[PDB]
Amino acid sequence: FKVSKNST
Amino acid sequence: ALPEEVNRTLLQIVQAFADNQIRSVAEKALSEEWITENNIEYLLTFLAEQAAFSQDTTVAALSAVLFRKLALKAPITHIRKEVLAQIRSSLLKGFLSERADSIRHKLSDAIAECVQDDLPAWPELLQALIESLKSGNPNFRESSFRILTTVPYLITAVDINSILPIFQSGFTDASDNVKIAAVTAFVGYFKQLPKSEWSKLGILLPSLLNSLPRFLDDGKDDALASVFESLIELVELAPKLFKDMFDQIIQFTDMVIKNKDLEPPARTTALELLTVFSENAPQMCKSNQNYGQTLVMVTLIMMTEVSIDDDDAAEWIESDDTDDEEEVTYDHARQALDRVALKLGGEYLAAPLFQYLQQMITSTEWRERFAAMMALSSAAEGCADVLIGEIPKILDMVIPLINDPHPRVQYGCCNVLGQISTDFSPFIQRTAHDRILPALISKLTSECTSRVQTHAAAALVNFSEFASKDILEPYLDSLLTNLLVLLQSNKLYVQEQALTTIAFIAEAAKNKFIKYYDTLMPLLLNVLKVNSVLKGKCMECATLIGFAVGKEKFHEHSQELISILVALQNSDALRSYLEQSWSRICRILGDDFVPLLPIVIPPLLITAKATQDVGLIEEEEAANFQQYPDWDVVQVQGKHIAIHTSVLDDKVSAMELLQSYATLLRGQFAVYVKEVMEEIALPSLDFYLHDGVRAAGATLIPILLSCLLAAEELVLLWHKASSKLIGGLMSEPMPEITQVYHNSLVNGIKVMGDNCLSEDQLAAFTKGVSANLTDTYERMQDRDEYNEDFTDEDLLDEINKSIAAVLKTTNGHYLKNLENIWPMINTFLLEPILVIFALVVIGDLIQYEQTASMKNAFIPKVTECLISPDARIRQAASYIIGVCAQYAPSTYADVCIPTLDTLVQIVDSKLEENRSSTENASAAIAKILYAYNSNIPDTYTANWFKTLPTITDKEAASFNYQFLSQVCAQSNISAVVDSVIQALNERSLTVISSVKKLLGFLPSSDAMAIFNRYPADIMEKVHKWF
């Protein structure tokens, strides 16, 4: 998919 | 202290607890015979004795736990005093005797169940705790703080000059275990007690902070991590408590994170500590240059910790395009920077951020050049307010690295160009396409490494999402020829990425993609006819290309495509690509999809009928249940419940698709309405454990009705649906959901039309409305020494809509019911959100001269509101005064004509923020001028006129031009016309007929000349208007 930033 | 028989009956039972048979017989015996009004106190007495005195670990343990469980359920309050006392005394003697650690822990927990607001004083406990705290046995000290954690109210009960030293010794204790329990107890106090009690222990915070460096001295960083966790809780509770030693804690966390021989837990929790101040005390962070500097510094350090012991990144080059879950500190650092940037803005962090990046971009250590890219990537969104303007500068830093010797630095650069294409959209697409696209395109060549080609392809998804077809057009052939190469990769993840990137570029390209359809589509069909995610991403790519090129072009392969889908569907990541693809074909095919409903709908019906899969569960059995991402456990009404979350998410997804089929196909979906309404929409409101389901049930309602309408049962279903919606209002806990139900009723009413409600329903709605307003008031009268809600505003916004909607359907009759909540309304009228609400309700009231009962109750506040500093208040106020003169012309005059000067002043205004409010006042005065026509001491109307045009508020504009259609001759003529052209062109509103009559009164040439000012585009419109 994309370029994004996770958050867990 | 029990009859000897009872003892070995109970002893047998409890021992049976640790085989199916012996153990089940005991379980039945216990629950059916012994936990009853008659035996409960015997049982509690027994278990307390065993826990206290049994020489067997297992029996003691079990009884302690059982006692704890049953003592709540009893509950302890309805137990005879003589028995409570005996229980207390044995529990206490057990505690003070010699027990193994874990039994003391369990005893402590049992003891806690025996301390209660309504329960008689137990001063022997108090005494026991104090003495135990001084014991030379750590387990005694630890266990005492544990009790103070379970029952923080005991801390209130001990003398302040005893409790202070207790905790100070606690923080400083030679045993780590004791320290952690002291700290836990100390924070628990703030967790549990009112803020008015906080100041009494607050003073101990510096001793706690001062104790911290000792953990690093003894090398006890694991225990440090636990204390950091307590401190994180305290920051969320009382950030301002930290103000005076803020620099000290900042510096401390700095020191920890830098020491990179420490294990990760101390370092990650220390970072978390720092991070959480920005989330709870942003002004405190911003008022201290040190915070920002430290936080940026430490995250940049941690971001460099990648590919350790692997300078070539061989392992990273060889793996798929997922995260290496071993790079923990690096992941944490990104997230932290992101979170703080989002909270503090660029105003505050860009400077310190960039100070470092300028330098890291130039390092010989690749890890730092990478870190730089990833940090910008993390901070870009939060810092957009500033960075959106420094876009050439940023590309000047980043783009030169696209060609770095190291492939991970290259990937890093891809990442930034991707991230900012999202975060600065749509402005970046417009202005940097000429730099960004060539940059990414150049990485696509098979010269570069798989990971880099893939990441550049990924970043083209970000860019495409907000790039117009015209911008992408000259770059398409090049973009496409490159992605075809990627399509020919050996590596599954490169093909997968290639497919998705093409799909999204095609989506953005729309009709500009028509010329590429013939090259793409057969390559795609070949892949399909031949690996699950490949096929799915491929079907996705095909159907998104389909939607881009339109139905006529899509028709060259639709049948074949359809046949492949069928084969694929009837043959779990794939399932979701399949469903969305069918859904996209329905959008392409329009009504020609109808014959495919039998294929597509049934699977969705099954999933959308999923039940609330709940397991009534036990305390212990719940944290490991929690490990699964697909499950969650909560405490609802006393019990523990395990709910299968994934299954309910999937139910939603299916509900959304059925909703979207229903929406597009309208009347053609009617055949499913009864079933979806009764088996899916309605039962979904009763899903108390998952709010998505409840909401998705609600939104489905009016859309299902409207489908059936377009094709008596309708009246039945609507009655059932509305009644459960109404019912939902008074039981629904979550304000966000409540809103959806009101909205849903509004939309239902809109569909069903005139008089769609019954009298009981109208009454049951009122109660719901009232309980909703009551709970909003209660939450809002809660919003400091220790600390630095559109959700509420939005709910009230919708309540306005439903009331209005109910009024309209009843044609006024709802006035009666509406009276009962007038005290409620009135409280609101005299905190801005509640005021605006009340005013809005009253405006709707007057719309239906029968309100005199309340004239006296509101005009005093309304007249006040007219000149309020808040535009939204003035707006609602003026509307009320205007509506007064419209529907209640005479019972209002003594007010309307006086205020009329106020309105001429509120008018003076013509600015985006309050263009709406001044337009309402304008309309309000035109209403008064109508009702009492030749009764006015007329400057007024010429004032009013100068407030034209009306361009923003639609209903206002509607009246003003109606009034304008009932000023003559003069050279007001060009202002008369333009006033109308402007309303029309701004699309805010037969006044045309009236205008033609005025222009009739003038020559050929005089008539023409008025439009001489107007540009071509609005003269096209004018021609088609007159």
Swiss-Prot record, chain A:
Where does this one sit in the cell?
Nucleus, Nuclear pore complex; Nucleus membrane
Tell me what PTMs the record reports for this protein.
Phosphorylated by CDC28.
| Superkingdom of this protein's organism | Eukaryota
Q: Which residues form a coiled coil?
A: none
Query: Per the record, what about its domains?
Result: Contains FG repeats. FG repeats are interaction sites for karyopherins (importins, exportins) and form probably an affinity gradient, guiding the transport proteins unidirectionally with their cargo through the NPC. FG repeat regions are highly flexible and lack ordered secondary structure. The overall conservation of FG repeats regarding exact sequence, spacing, and repeat unit length is limited. FG repeat types and their physico-chemical environment change across the NPC from the nucleoplasmic to the cytoplasmic side. The RRM Nup35-type domain might be involved in the control of mitosis.
UniProt function note = Functions as a component of the nuclear pore complex (NPC). NPC components, collectively referred to as nucleoporins (NUPs), can play the role of both NPC structural components and of docking or interaction partners for transiently associated nuclear transport factors. Active directional transport is assured by both, a Phe-Gly (FG) repeat affinity gradient for these transport factors across the NPC and a transport cofactor concentration gradient across the nuclear envelope (GSP1 and GSP2 GTPases associated predominantly with GTP in the nucleus, with GDP in the cytoplasm).
| Record's miscellaneous remark | Present with 2060 molecules/cell in log phase SD medium.
How would you summarize the oligomeric state and partners of this protein?
A: Component of the nuclear pore complex (NPC). NPC constitutes the exclusive means of nucleocytoplasmic transport. NPCs allow the passive diffusion of ions and small molecules and the active, nuclear transport receptor-mediated bidirectional transport of macromolecules such as proteins, RNAs, ribonucleoparticles (RNPs), and ribosomal subunits across the nuclear envelope. Due to its 8-fold rotational symmetry, all subunits are present with 8 copies or multiples thereof. NUP53 interacts with MAD1-MAD2.
Q: What is this protein called?
A: Nucleoporin NUP53
Tell me the organism.
Answer: Saccharomyces cerevisiae (strain ATCC 204508 / S288c) (Baker's yeast)
UniProt gene name: NUP53
Curated annotation (Swiss-Prot), chain B:
* A single cellular component GO annotation: cytoplasm
A GO biological process held by the record: regulation of mitotic nuclear division
Residue ranges spanning the membrane: these are none
Q: Which InterPro entries match?
A: ARM-like, ARM-type_fold, Importin_beta, Importin_rep_4, Importin_rep_5, Importin_rep_6
Sites where Phosphothreonine occurs are at T791
Give the subcellular location. Answer: Cytoplasm; Nucleus
- Keyword annotations for this protein? Acetylation, Cytoplasm, Nucleus, Phosphoprotein, Protein transport, Repeat, Transport
- State the Pfam families in the record: HEAT_EZ, Importin_rep_4, Importin_rep_5, Importin_rep_6
Gene3D superfamilies in UniProt: 6.10.140.1700, Leucine-rich Repeat Variant (1.25.10.10)
Question: Which Gene Ontology MF annotations are present?
Answer: nuclear import signal receptor activity; nuclear localization sequence binding
Q: Which SUPFAM superfamilies match?
A: ARM repeat
UniProt repeat feature HEAT, residue ranges: 4-35, 40-74, 81-114, 123-150, 160-192, 201-237, 245-280, 289-344, 346-380, 384-424, 426-466, 469-509, 511-549, 552-589, 591-665, 668-711, 713-752, 759-810, 813-848, 855-887, 895-932, 938-966, 972-1001, 1004-1026
What else does the entry mention about this protein?
Answer: Present with 15500 molecules/cell in log phase SD medium.
State how it assembles: Interacts with Ran (GSP1); interacts specifically with the GTP-bound form of Ran (GTP-Ran), protecting it from GTP hydrolysis and nucleotide exchange. Interacts with RPL25; this interaction is dissociated by binding to Ran-GTP. Interacts with YAP1; this interaction is dissociated by binding to Ran-GTP. Interacts with NOP1; via its rg-NLS. Interacts with SOF1; via its cNLS. Interacts with histones H3 and H4; via their NLS. Interacts with ABF1.
Q: Which family does it belong to?
A: Belongs to the importin beta family. Importin beta-3 subfamily.
Query: What does this chain do?
Result: Functions in nuclear protein import as nuclear transport receptor. Serves as receptor for classical and arginine/glycine-rich nuclear localization signals (cNLS and rg-NLS) in cargo substrates. Its predominant cargo substrate seems to be ribosomal proteins and ribosome biogenesis trans- and cis-acting factors. Required for nuclear transport of YAP1, NOP1 and SOF1. Mediates the nuclear import of histones H3 and H4. Mediates docking of the importin/substrate complex to the nuclear pore complex (NPC) through binding to repeat-containing nucleoporins.
Question: What protein name is recorded for this chain?
Answer: Importin subunit beta-3
Q: Which organism is it from?
A: Saccharomyces cerevisiae (strain ATCC 204508 / S288c)
